[PDB]
Design a protein around this ligand. Structure first.
Ligand SMILES: *N[C@@H](CC(=O)O)c1ccccc1
Ligand SMILES: *N[C@@H](CC(=O)O)c1ccccc1
Lengths: 513, 513
């Protein structure tokens, strides 16, 4: 189970695992009491004739309209229907689950004044496995996406339950749940915050961080394949800049290659060159240092590791927040109108994640050109075609795939968090587009795994050609796992399925994404 | 003076001020001894027949060429000429100064093995006020820019000295300095790192952080102008999300507006609406909460403040680093080939700064539409034209300026740190473009001040129209300073010069940028 207790923050790793595995939510007692008290406070404010948005006023474009408390249910049902205007394909079950868990987390903090009955119902709908159909396109940053959920919670719209699409009412009946009856604030509290962009955003972070870690082992395997030198990865020289991500990356690679005899000892190369010295300017077959896609790996992936730490922190904070409006402070029993639904932090974080993904993409696209071009590959056969070159083209065509997906990805990396357009009579006049920002990352992550897959495919074929006796233990593990999906290739063969296989099996944890 | 002492890190604020003011560099004794020892170690390595890039090998495309120690001077002079291939307009004096101070900082750490004589000469050339002419376009991320400097240091190329452009040799003679004589490694050590993108990058950070701080007071003045409510800025509701930049932004605005009577007390508005309540659905002239460009200001500028903290840290770390190759560790007397010249951290930081600038731009462009459109301005006259509307157009045309520069800026925000193209026989196969990334930020910052200038111009005219008796102390200070440059406008007048004046005098610290 995914346990929510008061004041204990939820980690990205926990919510990603809960959403991938459909872990049930369980609540600590104090969470129940806080959610309940928040509603009691609101009710007492309504008796005190407080004026509160979405309780006795209308919303969005009609912010200035008074609406009687007696008409609450009807206003809340109108609200969740009116803003459910997303279109296009439906989110997968894992993203839907993550979204609803992020909403449950936000509401659990006791500042939203959702009733305890509807809060438990939201959890129960989640627990029993109902997955509202959430159309992916539209929304300003997540009314659309969350209103698709609120509608299913009330016995409307559509959902998947046990592998079948059916009406919201059919799914509730099958799951054994009565639909929610919404009173004042309640529609608003279920739909007014950042939970879709968070739910998608967290699942993307978790996937990316995992792929990054794996890619340091793909890198180490490349370096063995290219006979790159390991001395530039020594932690001692990286402690000469205070960048933390760089020093971590170099340390991991350095430790992974410590027992390789494929990776090259710079001191051995230095000796070869010193022995050629005779007081003349002349060319050598050896070179004291390698090309940047090898030697600059820590300086290039270090910023990626560091921007991942910052993204993790922003997502963690946005997940562990009261992203809803208005909000009730239980200590002072005060109500605040505020802007906590605004997704700018997540949207910005997504644009940074997009940039990080394309930076990794360029690196791996460039590794691939090192393997393909015999002038760059440090003694490997052209196109890694070891037998019958000319009669066969070898792996030359994989680069047609990667350079194209890299180019497409570079063109797709325009920041969404700056694209704000004003709507709703200019009430929503500056908006994040955080969920579009996250959907665009998701596309770029698919691209990244394709290009990674071909670097790894190259690296395996390259070490086969070098001889694998000298592989490090950790890189040999990766080489082995890949060799269970793709053979050494001594004849020309379509690699489309091989690449899909490595992407799916080596480079993926969350297969729904 | 700008004092360099061993192991004490230099702050961005100090190097920005040194570069703006042409503070002289002074050295702590230990820095002198460390720089000297680094050279002695290298010399002893050369005697030991070590093979070291740029000392007895050639560089870039000719990495694999052995070059005799006897030919060192000639190789280093060839190197600084061959890579000085920048074109276009010359960097201003402040950016040039910052660049050379960042280089001096990097070399001061004692890992570069530049001679103590050439190190002191670099400082002396800086101190006496010689400013090498550095063409801004070109370079992969800063051989071009730093080789323009290295050439002037050796009595070549061109420089500005005492307000005149002249040859490098003329400027040295006038300043009383003998040109540098370069021995092995020395050309390479002067040009091989990140100092131009750092020098520009730091000057941009400092300017931006200052403009941000000022813009929180421009915001507070806007909110007074628009009669926005201050309750959504209360720190208590912002502590309901753990985002630090957001809570800081709201706190600053909340404290700045504490003594305003122009900004609106939400409780007063709540009372007005409660008094209109009569059990019917109906429209009110009052609304319990405001549009996002007012109420979401902390949620929008908070990510900007937070990404500024991360940028500050990356720049601080890159400034306080040994960004040079190869490097000597003095403890173990070991030499490392490495990738520490790679600007990926700065280039990525610049792309984030670009995004932050456009996010602020959208916000202020949107504030401007609140002032211009009487449906949005909460009781201000259309286009802030209080007298003779129709006969006069008022300030309506300023928005033609800002929407255009905002649109242009949005189109210019494609990340440069992903644009890598391979060169140099694929030795430089993955590159940062960090200096282009910084130059593009610089352009966006000019744009930002134009749009800010018109928001502030609007805000002043708006509070004049409200009556300024109720201004907060801090916002009245800003209103006053602006009113020394631009009057209240009761007739139609070209604002081009007014806007330039506010940009230059209110919104600028570093006038060279
Ligand atoms: N997200 C709500 C606005 C607010 O909370 O200030 C909203 C906006 C538009 C329509 C319904 C609800
Ligand atoms: N920046 C140098 C390369 C290295 O240090 O590895 C370089 C690159 C090209 C030409 C000259 C020097």
């Amino acid at each position: 189970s995914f346990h929510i207790s008061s004041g204990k923050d939820i980690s990205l790793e926990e919510i990603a695992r809960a959403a991938r595995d459909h872990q049930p939510v369980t609540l600590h007692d104090e969470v129940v009491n806080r959610v309940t008290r928040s509603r009691s406070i609101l009710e007492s404010m309504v008796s005190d004739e407080r004026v509160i948005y979405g309780v006795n006023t209308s919303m969005g474009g009609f912010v200035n309209y008074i609406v009687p408390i007696a008409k609450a249910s009807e206003l809340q049902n109108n609200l969740i229907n009116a803003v459910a205007t997303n279109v296009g394909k439906y989110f997968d079950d894992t993203t839907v689950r993550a979204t609803m868990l992020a909403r449950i987390v936000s509401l659990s903090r006791g500042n939203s004044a959702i009733s305890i009955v509807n809060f438990k119902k939201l959890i129960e709908i989640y627990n029993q496995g109902i997955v509202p159909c959430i159309p992916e396109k539209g929304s300003l940053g997540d009314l659309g996406p969350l209103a698709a959920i609120a509608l299913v919670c009330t016995g409307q719209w559509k959902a998947r339950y046990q592998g079948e699409q059916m009406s919201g009412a059919m799914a509730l009946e099958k799951a054994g749940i009565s639909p929610m009856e919404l009173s004042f604030k309640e529609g608003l509290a279920l739909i007014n915050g950042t939970s879709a962009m968070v739910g998608l955003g967290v699942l993307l972070y978790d996937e990316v961080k995992r792929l990054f870690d794996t890619y340091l082992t793909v890198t180490s395997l490349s370096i063995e394949g290219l006979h790159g030198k390991t001395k530039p990865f020594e932690p001692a020289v990286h402690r000469m800049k205070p960048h933390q991500g760089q020093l971590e990356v170099a340390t991991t690679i350095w430790e992974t290659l410590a027992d390789s005899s494929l990776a090259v000892n710079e001191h051995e190369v230095e000796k070869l060159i010193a022995e050629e010295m005779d007081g003349l300017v002349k060319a050598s077959n050896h070179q004291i240092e390698d090309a940047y896609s090898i030697r600059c790996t820590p300086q290039i992936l270090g910023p990626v590791a560091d921007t991942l730490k910052n993204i993790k922190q922003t997502l963690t904070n946005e997940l562990n927040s009261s992203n809803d409006n208005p909000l009730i402070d239980q200590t002072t029993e005060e109500v605040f109108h505020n802007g906590h639904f605004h997704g700018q932090y997540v949207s910005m974080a997504m644009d940074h994640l997009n940039i990080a993904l394309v930076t990794m993409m360029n690196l791996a696209n460039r590794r691939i050109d090192r393997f393909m071009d015999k002038s760059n590959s440090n003694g490997l056969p052209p196109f890694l075609c070891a037998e019958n070159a000319g009669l066969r083209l070898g792996l030359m065509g994989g680069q047609f795939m990667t350079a194209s997906i890299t180019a497409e990805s570079r063109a797709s990396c325009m920041p969404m968090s700056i694209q704000s357009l004003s709507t709703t009579g200019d009430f929503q006049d500056i908006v994040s587009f955080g969920l579009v920002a996250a959907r665009r990352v998701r596309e770029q992550l698919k691209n990244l795994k394709y290009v990674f897959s071909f670097e790894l495919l190259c690296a395996c074929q390259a070490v086969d050609i070098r001889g694998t006796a000298g592989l490090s233990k950790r890189t040999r593990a990766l080489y082995d796992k890949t060799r269970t999906l793709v053979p050494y290739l001594e004849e020309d063969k379509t690699i489309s399925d091989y690449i899909e296989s490595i992407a799916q099996t080596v480079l993926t944890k969350n297969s729904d994404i």
